[PDB]
Amino acid sequence: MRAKWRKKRTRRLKRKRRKVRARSK
Amino acid sequence: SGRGAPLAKVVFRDPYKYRLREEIFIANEGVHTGQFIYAGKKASLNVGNVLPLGSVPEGTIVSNVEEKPGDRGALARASGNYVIIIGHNPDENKTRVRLPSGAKKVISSDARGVIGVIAGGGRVDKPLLKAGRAFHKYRLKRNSWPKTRGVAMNPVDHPHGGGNHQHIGKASTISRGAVSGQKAGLIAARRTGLLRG
Amino acid sequence: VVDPFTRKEWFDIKAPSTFENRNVGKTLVNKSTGLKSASDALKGRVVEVCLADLQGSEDHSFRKIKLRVDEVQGKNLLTNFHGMDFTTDKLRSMVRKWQTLIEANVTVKTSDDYVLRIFAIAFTRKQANQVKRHSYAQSSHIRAIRKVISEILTKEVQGSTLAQLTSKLIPEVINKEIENATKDIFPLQNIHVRKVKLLKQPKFDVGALMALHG
Amino acid sequence: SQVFGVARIYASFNDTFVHVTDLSGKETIARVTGGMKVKADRDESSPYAAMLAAQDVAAKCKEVGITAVHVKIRATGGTRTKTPGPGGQAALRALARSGLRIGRIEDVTPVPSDSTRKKGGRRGRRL
Amino acid sequence: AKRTKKVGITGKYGVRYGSSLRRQVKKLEIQQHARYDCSFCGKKTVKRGAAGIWTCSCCKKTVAGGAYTVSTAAAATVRSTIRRLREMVEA
Amino acid sequence: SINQKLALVIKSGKYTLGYKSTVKSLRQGKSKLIIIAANTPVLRKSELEYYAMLSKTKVYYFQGGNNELGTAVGKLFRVGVVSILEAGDSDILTTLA
Amino acid sequence: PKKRASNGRNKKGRGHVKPVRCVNCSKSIPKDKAIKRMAIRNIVEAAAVRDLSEASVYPEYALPKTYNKLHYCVSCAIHARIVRVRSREDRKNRAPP
RNA sequence: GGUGAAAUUCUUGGAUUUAUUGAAGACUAACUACUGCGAAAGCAUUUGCCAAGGACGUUUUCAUUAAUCAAGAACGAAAGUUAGGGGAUCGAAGAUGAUCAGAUACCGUCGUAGUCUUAACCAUAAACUAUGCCGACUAGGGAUCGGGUGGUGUUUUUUUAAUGACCCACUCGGCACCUUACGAGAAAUCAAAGUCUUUGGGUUCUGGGGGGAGUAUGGUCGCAAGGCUGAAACUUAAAGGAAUUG
Numbered sequence A: 001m002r003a004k005w006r007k008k009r010t011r012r013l014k015r016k017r018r019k020v021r022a023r024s025k
Numbered sequence B: 001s002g003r004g005a006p007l008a009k010v011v012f013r014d015p016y017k018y019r020l021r022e023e024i025f026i027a028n029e030g031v032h033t034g035q036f037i038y039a040g041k042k043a044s045l046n047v048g049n050v051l052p053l054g055s056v057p058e059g060t061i062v063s064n065v066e067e068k069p070g071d072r073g074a075l076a077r078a079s080g081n082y083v084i085i086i087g088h089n090p091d092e093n094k095t096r097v098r099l100p101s102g103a104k105k106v107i108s109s110d111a112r113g114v115i116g117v118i119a120g121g122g123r124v125d126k127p128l129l130k131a132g133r134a135f136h137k138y139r140l141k142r143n144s145w146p147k148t149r150g151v152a153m154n155p156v157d158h159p160h161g162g163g164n165h166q167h168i169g170k171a172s173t174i175s176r177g178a179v180s181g182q183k184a185g186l187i188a189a190r191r192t193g194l195l196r197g
Numbered sequence C: 001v002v003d004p005f006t007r008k009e010w011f012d013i014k015a016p017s018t019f020e021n022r023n024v025g026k027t028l029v030n031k032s033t034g035l036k037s038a039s040d041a042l043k044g045r046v047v048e049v050c051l052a053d054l055q056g057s058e059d060h061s062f063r064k065i066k067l068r069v070d071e072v073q074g075k076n077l078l079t080n081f082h083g084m085d086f087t088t089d090k091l092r093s094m095v096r097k098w099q100t101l102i103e104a105n106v107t108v109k110t111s112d113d114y115v116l117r118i119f120a121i122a123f124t125r126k127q128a129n130q131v132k133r134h135s136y137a138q139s140s141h142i143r144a145i146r147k148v149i150s151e152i153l154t155k156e157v158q159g160s161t162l163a164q165l166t167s168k169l170i171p172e173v174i175n176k177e178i179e180n181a182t183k184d185i186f187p188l189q190n191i192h193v194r195k196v197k198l199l200k201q202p203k204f205d206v207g208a209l210m211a212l213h214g
Numbered sequence D: 001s002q003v004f005g006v007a008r009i010y011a012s013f014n015d016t017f018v019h020v021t022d023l024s025g026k027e028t029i030a031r032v033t034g035g036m037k038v039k040a041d042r043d044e045s046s047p048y049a050a051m052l053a054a055q056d057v058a059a060k061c062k063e064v065g066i067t068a069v070h071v072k073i074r075a076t077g078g079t080r081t082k083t084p085g086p087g088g089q090a091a092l093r094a095l096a097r098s099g100l101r102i103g104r105i106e107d108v109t110p111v112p113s114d115s116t117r118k119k120g121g122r123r124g125r126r127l
Numbered sequence E: 001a002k003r004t005k006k007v008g009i010t011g012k013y014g015v016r017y018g019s020s021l022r023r024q025v026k027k028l029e030i031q032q033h034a035r036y037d038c039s040f041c042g043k044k045t046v047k048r049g050a051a052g053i054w055t056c057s058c059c060k061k062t063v064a065g066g067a068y069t070v071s072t073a074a075a076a077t078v079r080s081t082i083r084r085l086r087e088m089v090e091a
Numbered sequence F: 001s002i003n004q005k006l007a008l009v010i011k012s013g014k015y016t017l018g019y020k021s022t023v024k025s026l027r028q029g030k031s032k033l034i035i036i037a038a039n040t041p042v043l044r045k046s047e048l049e050y051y052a053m054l055s056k057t058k059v060y061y062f063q064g065g066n067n068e069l070g071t072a073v074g075k076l077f078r079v080g081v082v083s084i085l086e087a088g089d090s091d092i093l094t095t096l097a
Numbered sequence G: 001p002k003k004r005a006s007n008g009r010n011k012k013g014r015g016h017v018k019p020v021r022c023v024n025c026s027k028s029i030p031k032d033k034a035i036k037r038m039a040i041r042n043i044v045e046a047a048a049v050r051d052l053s054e055a056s057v058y059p060e061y062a063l064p065k066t067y068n069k070l071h072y073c074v075s076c077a078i079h080a081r082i083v084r085v086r087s088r089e090d091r092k093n094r095a096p097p
Numbered sequence H: 001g002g003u004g005a006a007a008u009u010c011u012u013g014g015a016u017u018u019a020u021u022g023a024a025g026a027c028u029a030a031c032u033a034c035u036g037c038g039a040a041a042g043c044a045u046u047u048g049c050c051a052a053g054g055a056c057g058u059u060u061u062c063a064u065u066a067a068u069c070a071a072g073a074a075c076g077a078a079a080g081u082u083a084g085g086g087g088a089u090c091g092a093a094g095a096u097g098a099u100c101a102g103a104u105a106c107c108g109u110c111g112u113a114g115u116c117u118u119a120a121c122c123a124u125a126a127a128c129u130a131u132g133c134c135g136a137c138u139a140g141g142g143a144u145c146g147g148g149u150g151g152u153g154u155u156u157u158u159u160u161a162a163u164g165a166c167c168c169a170c171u172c173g174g175c176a177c178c179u180u181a182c183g184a185g186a187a188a189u190c191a192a193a194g195u196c197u198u199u200g201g202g203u204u205c206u207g208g209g210g211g212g213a214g215u216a217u218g219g220u221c222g223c224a225a226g227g228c229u230g231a232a233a234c235u236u237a238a239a240g241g242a243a244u245u246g
Helices: A003-024 B131-138 C038-042 C088-094 C141-157 C162-169 C174-180 C206-212 D047-061 D086-097 E008-013 E019-033 E073-090 F003-011 F019-027 F042-055 F066-072 G046-054 G074-079
Strands: B007-013 B020-026 B050-052 B061-065 B083-089 B094-098 B104-108 B112-115 C046-049 C064-073 C076-085 C101-109 C115-123 C195-198 D004-006 D009-011 D016-022 D028-033 D068-074 D101-107 E044-050 E053-056 E062-064 F014-017 F033-036 F058-061 F081-086 G035-042 G065-072
Touching: B020 B061, B061 E073, C038 C064, C064 C206, C076 C162, C076 C206, C088 D101, C088 G065, C101 C141, C115 C141, C141 C174, D009 D086, D016 D047, D016 D086, D028 D047, D047 D086, D068 D086, D086 D101, D086 G046, E008 E019, E019 E044, F014 F019, F019 F042, F019 F081, F033 F042, F042 F058, G035 G046, G065 G074
Parallel strands: D004 D068, D009 D068, D068 D101, F033 F058
Antiparallel strands: B007 B020, B050 B112, B061 B083, B061 B112, B083 B094, B094 B104, C046 C064, C064 C076, C076 C195, C101 C115, C115 C195, D004 D016, D009 D016, D016 D028, E044 E053, E053 E062, F014 F081, F033 F081, G035 G065
16 A cells, blocks of 8 residues: 555554544543 | 614704704715715715715725615714725616625615715624623614514414424415515525525 | 537628738627527627738737627627737647746726736746856846736737727837847747736726727 | 538547538537448447448538538547547548548647647556 | 744633634634824724724724724725726816 | 935034924034924924925935934934034935935 | 656756647647657659659649648657657667667 | 447437527636745635845954753644635545446536635645754765856847846755765665764654554543543554565
8 A cells, every 4th residue: 555545544543543542541 | 873884963054044053974984084075976086975876986996875865874874884886877878786695786866875885894793792782782773683583472462483392384485465474484485595506 | 409500690700900801710609589588699799800811810829819799780799999909729729848937917997997917927047148047037137027017918908999909019119128128138939918808897988999990 | 713611520439520610610410420321339430330321411412512622630639538539530531532622631630739638547547 | 021932812712612613713813903104193093893884992083994893895995996987077 | 216315414414303403403503404204294394394395304204214314324213304404515405306 | 657757858958948739649748858750742643753753734843842840748659659769878868880 | 419339318399419608606728837935734817905025245243142952832735613705626425427347436417515715613635855953064066946256158129239038167055966975874765864883063853573553541632523631451573664576
């Protein structure tokens, strides 16, 4: 994959994690 | 009160009887105390001067415009609001304006309006921000606040009212040819939903 | 079912007398029916013509002229000068790389209430014994040239009416008056007014119209 | 001695228009396209249907009083390709040999002094 | 001392009303109470009397200006464009 | 190109500054140049035109308000009018400007 | 690797020039990176001028010749024969012919 | 109308096409360059104003005032976000008609945010000439831009007169360019990537096999989007560079 969509997919994962992490916090 | 637009105690000498005639104008952006206002056909073009729309050239900014010659002002009286003259029709003694609503209107040349946007502009750009300001805004206008939603009302009290759930039930859009009592909700809605999409 | 070509009278065209042969061309509109007279229908139309046709010389192959009908004398229609534009071939022809062109524009009325926009074209010239590959301008002579050209153009339409303008423009004296006032700054290759657009027309004044047709 | 009209050819892709008008250009005479000549939806831009469409005008361009014509070639223009299609060179040739005195032939392709955003996108069409 | 970081004038509104509503009112309430130079006496003494009324404290003048500024941008362009129309008609 | 020579007046020549001092300095007739701001009230400048006409002395209209004039005269306060009692190596008096 | 001395563009010392669309696929490319062709052809065919002269009331005709600048992306240019992939040592040959 | 082909779409109420205007918004094509400016990002209509500049010239003037630069700071394409205006084109999303086996992709039509502006944010790009900045030196050339110097050179109403453009010999500065490699480099290639094992002009930042990973955490900035700082466990013997042959 390009450097772009590897980064984009981790960015989407980071977005998901922060909501879940804060959801308990 | 009940009007953001400030008034101007403009004073004219009555040419027929010795007495000054104190007359209420809506102040424009740039008029101050002691300023001379020149009203009439042979007036100059400065902010505050009242001129017939025929003399003033195209592409200017005119507020407090008369719909017909002699109505003593009808259009663009709200704060910060103005009418752009977009063209003239000197053959038919009728000018062409762009109204604040975006509508294009035809006005008699003999009609007139002050020059310059109405003062008090930007009033809506700050939220009332609390119920107290909203109450004190409409206290000086009329009893039209608070405005209870028809849905919360009982069926007897509003067409939308009633039901075990707070819902309108019928389409909120109401025909124009409806009758008093029908016209609750969206009256004669050409197209509902969000503008710009 | 109803053939359209069988309901016209084939009206003609007149050119202003400050031109070559007055007659230009014959156009079809309709019969002069009782409800709508053919005169009103004919009015307000514009016809594109070639200055080579309206002067008889190939010198004027470009700069096609635009005419507008004014009064319908029977089948023969007199016209006022409405504008002129270069043919798209000629504009593309004179423009070539490695030579800067000058775009000049003035918005000035005639002597009467008959306002038009005068353009002007100018092209930097390959000088004699000159060996630079391009010979561009210095973008300050361009400011200087556009001022002096605009001075020439503004002092021209303001000085004479449209009829006097066209009568003196057909020998192409104006584009020479630009050069001789710019020979002191920079040499130019293609110099032409290149465009006019007519905006406002005053009281028609059939006295003025019949002067140029009669 | 002779009458001038205007041929006013719209020479684009996917269709071609041969549409002779009076010298003023407002009155339309025999506006015929390729779609009326060919029902195969392919010759409509091919020079064949251009030649068949353009020969149909002269079949009726006469006997009305159109002796000569000022041909005015125009491509699509605007933001689009701006070049004339295959019919522009051939539908011209149906006029020439059909018995119409052609004069003052010229292009009137609308050149944008500056256009809007071109249709297709930044990366453009991909096939 | 430095009492607030970013609420500024709007800290009187407490924690209520949200942060965005406080931000819109913040950037206008500053313009509302800011003192402005008078175009007539030259002293930075113009205060807002009412909605759209700007009384210069000295020289007892008052100018009909915007509701939250002595002169709105949408009206400064009015003054500028009125000039050209007056300029072109006369000269 | 006026502001450069006011420092010449402020250092070499003798001035008086403000309205009351100017009209006194016009009444005495010593003043020859008065520079009136544009922000000054038009009535006050109107009768200074009159006093200047009475004294047959040059009146110059500054291209700005009293804030520009106050900076131009070199003083961080504001000045409505400034009068030039005598000008030294400054040439503002002898020049038409 | 580094295929060209000037990367693909006649751009040295700017940082940005302009986007230009292509006359075939409409792809936004720098104007200097484009393949510029001054297509200078007549409205009519080469063999076509004979009938025009025969079928014109103008015995001495002008033979008009239209101008149009086809700005081409290299993706379209190579496919459209406009340019050809050249030898590595012959890549430096910048001469138009 | 559209296509490679079609279909969706609009059309005997007239689409498309022709002409005339009128408005709306966007942009400044051709000219337009191995050309200019800007610190960079960027800047291509005219005209006016405001102020800023670099180069040139200077027998003017201050006379060590300098270079680089942690901390810190302003600007910073596009996208994005907030509020307002604007809202023509194109166009994420979305909807559709084709293609294939599937096509929620490429193609076509419509179309929202967006594209434009006012005021703020973010502070990122293959933000690249992938070549930090300053200094000197080393080879030749040619053009080009801007400035300057000289010619009884050409050229401008007057035919060495009331004087710009040009050509010549130059020079300063710049964007670069062509050959050559003396020299360097792994080579591609480089006149600077040269003056580095004959190793040292000054100075800042960054890298230590590839993944994990620019991830987790923690802090800070941000309306958010996210930016900056930034590992480890674990895992592999290789990824990678430049050229040769097939």
